[PDB]
Structures are given as C-alpha cells and as structure tokens.
C-alpha cells in the first residue's frame, strides 16, 4: 500500500510504500473489541472496602435476654439489620486485569493500523523540525496539511522540540514510536506520522 508524502507545508513529494503484512492485512473486528476491553479494565485502581460484622467498633455482649422480655431475639448491636451495623458482601480490594495470548495482541495492532490506512486517514510527512518549541508554528503546520479532527501525532525519538510544541493543543495527542497502544489509535481520527517513525514501527511489529 502506497501513501502520499508531504513536507511541513508542501505537496505530494511522491509516495512511500509500506509493508503489506502490517498496513494491509484485512482487520479482525472481535480481536479489536477484546483488546479495547482488556486495556480499559487494565487501568483501574480497585481500592474500595467496607466493614463487615466483625470489623465495626462495637459490642460482644448479648444486648437483652433470649426470652421473657416480649422482644425479638438479638445478638449484637452490630448486626446487618441494625442501624449502624456492618455490611454483608460489600466491595473488597480486587485486581481487574488479565492477559490475552500473544498472537491476538499482535493481530489487533496490525488490524487497527491497517484500518487507519484503508480509509486514507494516515498522513505521512518527511520531517517535523523546530528551532524553538513554539505552539503557534505547530498549529500552522497542522492547518498546512488540512487536519481538522482529533489526531494522534506519532513521533520518533528525542524530537523534543516537536513534542513540546504539540502538547497543550486540545485536539492533539503525542506518542513516540516505541510506545503506541491499541487504545491510542482507535480514539483518534487520524494519525500524523513522520517517515522515520514509520520505518521504526515497521521494525518492531515485524
């Protein structure tokens, strides 16, 4: 599959042929559903507790007698049905994370990038260079390529001036090429990846 190339402003500086095993392989839709659900349940901090009958600061004495008083037999001031008593079967501290086998992780990565390509939603550019970290120039660059939606900006390496310039824009996310997840690509509308970062991704997904 060939994508068109651009410069920080210009036009169609040719094309770039990318892999067919990574960017052209007919996505699998249930594998992607599984990946998204697993990743979202993987971000939880399950820190929640409540006090059962024996943890509530309270009484070990039988409050009245068992018979005679014209009453109902009671066992403690802290029973589940008493006001102020302990909870039966509440939340406990838990984990919430699990793992899917290794071939379906890789299949979901390939499938989601290949879906991005199959709709001309990936945009390749030669380079993103900046002599100072300036947000305004990044916004001009972004309009130079006519990008008006949520965008994932995939960068290479210690390209630190570009990542600084692209922060803080409320439509823009920045990720480096050794740290792309399935949830980053699905949430954005487009991907703006540089030529260097594209080969670096092809090197690790193999």
């Amino acid at each position: 599959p060939n994508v068109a190339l651009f410069k920080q402003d210009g036009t169609q500086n040719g094309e770039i042929t990318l892999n067919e095993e990574i960017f052209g392989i007919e996505p699998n839709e249930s594998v992607v559903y599984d990946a998204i659900i697993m990743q979202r349940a993987s971000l939880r901090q399950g820190t929640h507790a409540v006090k059962n009958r024996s943890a509530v600061r309270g009484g070990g004495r039988k409050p009245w007698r068992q018979k005679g008083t014209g009453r109902a037999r009671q066992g403690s001031i802290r029973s589940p049905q008493w006001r102020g008593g302990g909870v039966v079967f509440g939340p406990t501290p838990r984990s919430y994370s699990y793992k899917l086998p290794k071939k379906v992780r890789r299949l979901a990565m390939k499938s989601v990038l290949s879906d991005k390509v199959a709709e001309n939603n990936l945009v390749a550019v030669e380079g993103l260079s900046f002599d100072a970290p300036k947000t305004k120039e990044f916004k001009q660059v972004l309009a130079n390529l006519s990008i008006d939606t949520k965008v994932l900006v995939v960068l290479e390496n210690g390209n630190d001036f570009a990542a600084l310039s692209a922060r803080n824009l409320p439509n823009v996310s920045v990720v480096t090429s050794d740290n792309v997840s399935v949830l980053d690509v699905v949430s954005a509308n487009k991907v703006l990846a540089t030529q260097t970062a594209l080969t670096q991704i092809e090197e690790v997904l193999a």
Binding site: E29, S30, V32, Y33, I36, V112, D115, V186, S187
Partner: peptide, 13 residues
C-alpha cells in the same frame, strides 16, 4: 472501529 459503536461477537457474553 470507533469507541462509540462497540459490539462483542454474538454468543460471547
């Protein structure tokens, strides 16, 4: 797949 149109496979949950 978009994050506002998810669908598990039939018979799976």
């Amino acid at each position: 797949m978009k994050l506002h149109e998810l669908k598990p496979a039939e018979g799976s949950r």
